[PDB]
Design a binder for this molecule. Structure first.
Ligand SMILES: O=C(COCc1ccccc1)Nc1ccc(Cl)cc1
Ligand SMILES: [Cl-]
Length: 134
């Protein structure tokens, strides 16, 4: 009995009115969530955001919702996101490579969204029950 669930990944980015002391020009926030009123905490163990190496503590871990990271910076980068599942079976996690892009000053703030389909073929009963609760 295969089960399909939905994950939304996205981010916002806005030019700061005043650069930070480091000269960072943008504030941004990247997130993983369920669509509409879906609570993905039923089947998500943790979300790991792998920031660019220039960031302090580049491995950011959210064990509880909201699964998000808020930061400031000066350039966009590819941000690997690992979503770990509440199971003890294959797969333990899934990985997405998120394009954390920023727009130049003058352009409207970034507000970006993509939606990811996860289909689990033959999950264990306990994991199937969690997936179906989201
Ligand atoms: O945007 C930033 C700012 O982050 C670094 C930081 C240093 C000290 C404190 C906070 C944050 N780095 C960055 C570098 C290369 C690429 Cl390709 C994309 C981004
Ligand atoms: Cl991807």
């Amino acid at each position: 009995c295969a089960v399909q669930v939905k994950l939304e990944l996205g981010h916002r980015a806005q030019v700061r009115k005043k650069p930070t002391v480091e000269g960072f020009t943008h504030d941004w926030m990247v997130f993983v969530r369920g669509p509409e009123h879906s609570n993905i905490q039923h089947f998500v163990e943790k979300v790991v955001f792998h920031l660019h190496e220039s960031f302090p503590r580049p491995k950011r871990v959210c064990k509880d919702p909201p699964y998000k990271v808020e930061e400031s910076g000066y350039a966009g980068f590819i941000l690997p996101i690992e979503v770990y599942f509440k199971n003890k079976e294959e797969p333990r996690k899934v990985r997405f490579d998120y394009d954390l892009f920023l727009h130049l000053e003058g352009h409207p703030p970034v507000n970006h969204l993509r939606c990811e389909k996860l289909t689990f073929n033959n999950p264990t009963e306990d994991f199937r029950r969690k997936l179906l609760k989201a």
